[PDB]
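Q: Convert this sequence to structure tokens.
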Amino acid sequence: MPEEEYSEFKELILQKELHVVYALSHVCGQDRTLLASILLRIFLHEKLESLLLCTLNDREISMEDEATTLFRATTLASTLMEQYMKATATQFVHHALKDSILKIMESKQSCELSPSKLEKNEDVNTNLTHLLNILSELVEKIFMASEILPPTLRYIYGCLQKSVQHKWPTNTTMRTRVVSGFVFLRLICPAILNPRMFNIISDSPSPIAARTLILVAKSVQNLANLVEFGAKEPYMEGVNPFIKSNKHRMIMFLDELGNVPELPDTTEHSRTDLSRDLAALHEICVAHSDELRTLSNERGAQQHVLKKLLAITELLQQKQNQYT
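A:
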């Protein structure tokens, strides 16, 4: 239908309490991916991507009863963050990673640290010095790419930081850890493991390049978590000096990544027709009318909106298949 016909449904969805978004995330179990895509396009269109992401992130933080597991599970929140970073952080990812990865793709020099995988005669020591050289150059490129990360994403990171400080006030470690979990575990380290998904690379890595990518991503992830490899990871121990000496640089990077206090937001005016995505979301409400009606029967602050939602869903279904 014409975009205007969805304007009632849309003002419900964009409300600050996000009760419709919460109900939708509930009824959509597996198909988080689809819901995330539609919601992000809608909220992006309206310049309300921060309202969506910041609110969902704070909700996850509030529900977490163990700070060590924060954001580890696959949620709508984490899925939205991944899609959002994918859409906006490409220049950061290229600035951070492209040159290092293209060198690795072209390199004939092994970083193999497992002696048993040496098979036909090379030297782990030589392989370690090389890996440590790769790591130094890379980590410098990542840290100095800080300013390239878009302001809005940095603002969203700053909001994560204020949120975990409030939740765990005597834990002085969370404000860097919560940022690491997005920019490394869910952005940089996946990109090193599969450089194709940010189109850094076009062809599958050679075996030596493939191994180096794995060992580089492993090393970076441990530095990102500010932890040395232990005795259960015996061959990775040679990277421990690198991690130890670089832990403070990692902390400085993660801390300052969120140092955008105010919402930037400026993009002027993006109003292409949105009714296509509004129709997609309406289909979801219709597909789950049964569930949402069950959720609407619960008293509480969400109840007003949800009864309103089912109403709107039925009316748009009237206007749809009406005789004309």
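The first helix runs from residue 7 to 13.
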